[PDB]
């Protein structure tokens, strides 16, 4: 009879140990996870072939397994390498995109090696000074200027 709207949905989904949830589109609901932004969320779903205008509550579990492999292995599905965060990274040398649990663990590990080398651009990031060419006369008084994450 009527098929432009699904019969029933779901609310909360568990993917990569974050609670992506809601009656949102697959482009907007996948923007909850860090490491995945609004450009790359639309870029991955066109390769898997699932339509963007589909609410994530109604979805088949076989479609979920392609999603788990694509974000984990982004060079297999056919993404060009320009979308990655670590393009030619110093620790390895090959292109890889970061997902939350390895993402934070790689970032703080980069911060520790600058403490032993006393890299003056790097150690100001830890206490919270502005590393770029800003003038600190009459701006940013009570605030801190390190690396910032939500929650």
């Amino acid at each position: 009879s009527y098929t432009s709207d699904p019969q029933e949905l779901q609310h909360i989904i568990r993917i990569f140990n974050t609670n992506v949830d809601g009656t949102k589109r697959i482009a907007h609901a996948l923007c909850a996870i860090t490491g995945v932004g609004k450009r790359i969320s639309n870029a991955i779903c066109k390769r898997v072939g699932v339509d963007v205008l589909r609410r994530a509550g109604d979805l088949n579990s076989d479609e979920l397994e392609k999603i788990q492999k694509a974000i984990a292995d982004p060079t297999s599905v056919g993404i060009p390498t320009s979308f990655f965060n670590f393009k030619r990274n110093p620790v390895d040398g090959n292109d890889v995109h970061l997902v939350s649990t390895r993402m934070d663990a790689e970032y703080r590990m980069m911060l520790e090696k600058g403490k032993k080398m006393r890299h003056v651009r790097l150690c100001r990031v830890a206490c919270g000074l502005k590393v770029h060419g800003q003038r600190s006369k009459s701006n940013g008084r009570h605030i801190r200027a390190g690396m910032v994450f939500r929650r």
Partner: protein, 91 residues
Amino acid sequence: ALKAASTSKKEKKKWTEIKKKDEARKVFTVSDELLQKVEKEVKKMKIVTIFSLGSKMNLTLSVSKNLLRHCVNKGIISLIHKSQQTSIYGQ
């Protein structure tokens, strides 16, 4: 010795009430009974728009667009005015 006025930086802080409590959710899915109740009521109603039916049947406006589009695919009501701002469904 005319006037001596001093102010503090403690006065410039704002006072606000904490938060307003959250509201219950609207429905986002179509039921079989929701299919029937929209078609009988729209045939009575003369000028129909998007906000009007969601304010009745508690529906979000994203699912109410297709309910108006499905009704005009039948010969019940017709879109009588359209601009970039607002479309008007009438008879």
